[PDB]
Ligand binder design. Structure first.
Ligand SMILES: CO[C@@H]1OC[C@@H](O)[C@@H](O)[C@@H]1O
Ligand SMILES: CO[C@@H]1OC[C@@H](O)[C@@H](O)[C@@H]1O
Ligand SMILES: CO[C@@H]1OC[C@@H](O)[C@@H](O)[C@@H]1O
Ligand SMILES: CO[C@@H]1OC[C@@H](O)[C@@H](O)[C@@H]1O
Ligand SMILES: [Ca+2]
Ligand SMILES: [Ca+2]
Ligand SMILES: [Ca+2]
Ligand SMILES: [Ca+2]
Ligand SMILES: [Ca+2]
Ligand SMILES: [Ca+2]
Ligand SMILES: [Ca+2]
Ligand SMILES: [Ca+2]
Lengths: 114, 114, 114, 114
């Protein structure tokens, strides 16, 4: 199944933050309406924040996270969880290798903000 | 029900990261085995990452998040999510006021690292 | 925080199923737009299905689960999780006693159907 | 990533319940320690509970859900969610066709019981 794809309400500000846990240099691209709206990169085996930004979901509400290491797309896992019918988390894990820890780049999307 | 309390595997590194979305200054306390192990504070209505840290879950694995605003404890909501039976997120929202957006301080705990 | 309340898409069929894990008979009420849409009653300490029904979210999309034992409201815990940006679960646990297992009545709401 | 595989605590009672939402007859197999422990079959486009059962995770704690339709394995999507650090749900959706609703068989595992 498709992973790392989320539908947000239109024209909604959302946070996106990425962490790295790998010997591979992570590139995290955040697409809004199928167009790259943010790009983060970095390398850490200690969960370093490699990027954080506030974006707007725009007219489509279409948000997609992609992760690559050396030009190769990582395998993604994702889900959305909603707390008290108000607070949204869109969560993404990724695997760049053979150990199946899925933490190589970890991406957290949250909304609403403010 | 108790919120913001999580049983992690014992003696395991985890990331804890806090975001602010309130006019009130947030103070986030992270307890490991009932002792403060980290404290983050800031004020933002735009999802500022007021703190991020790697901690060890210790002998019990008990991790507790508490949030206060001008010395008043915020109301918490929480859940844990596991993807592909490997990637763990413990999630906390908090409310310091009356609008019930529960984003006033948002705390994300993630493991495993490395 | 409020628990057991969910905003579904309008005019959408959803499944509701309730399980019992308590020595006391559980009364589960499902409200749609603040009015009774279904009520389940049964007793099991072995996860018996005490009710299952297809309902419609109607014009409000507001669905609320309440649980009581002997007319005394149980303490609720809930969340919504969305898989592959398509499949929705609204989950409820309840506690009627002192052991905090929160399984005394467990309610699972799923959509879309068909 | 592997889906539909969950590690439960050893020797834990759990419920497993399967719902159908497809023109195709669903076959759901539940394995414990790599051996079939429950099987359900049925066709519904109205979220019928095609089966529910209580099992024990045994010494391994390894529980796997498989879904097939007329001999072909469905594509699975899964996650686990824990409420109030106590109440567990392991969630499975599956897709047997082209519309990607992932509801064709839905499987919910819950613990603790009792
Ligand atoms: C060579 O493997 C990569 O770096 C070290 C670990 O973080 C692994 O999970 C990762 O896939
Ligand atoms: C005065 O209210 C506080 O600041 C503005 C908003 O962020 C509110 O959600 C928050 O509770
Ligand atoms: C009297 O206690 C009730 O019945 C037995 C157990 O299922 C308990 O969890 C429940 O609260
Ligand atoms: C022919 O398609 C199958 O039956 C009707 C719908 O339930 C579809 O989701 C399912 O994949
Ligand atoms: Ca890896
Ligand atoms: Ca890694
Ligand atoms: Ca607020
Ligand atoms: Ca706020
Ligand atoms: Ca109980
Ligand atoms: Ca119980
Ligand atoms: Ca389908
Ligand atoms: Ca279907």
């Amino acid at each position: 199944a498709t992973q790392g794809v989320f539908t947000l309400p239109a024209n909604t500000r959302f946070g996106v933050t990425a962490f790295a846990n790998s010997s591979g240099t992570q590139t995290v691209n955040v697409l809004v309406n199928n167009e790259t709206a943010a790009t983060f990169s970095g390398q850490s085996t200690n969960n370093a924040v490699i990027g954080t930004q506030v974006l707007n979901s725009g007219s489509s509400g279409k948000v997609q996270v992609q992760v690559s290491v050396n030009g190769r797309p990582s395998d993604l896992v994702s889900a959305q969880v909603i707390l008290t019918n108000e607070l949204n988390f869109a969560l993404v894990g990724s695997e760049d290798g053979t150990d199946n820890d899925y933490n190589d780049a970890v991406v957290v999307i949250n909304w609403p903000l403010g």
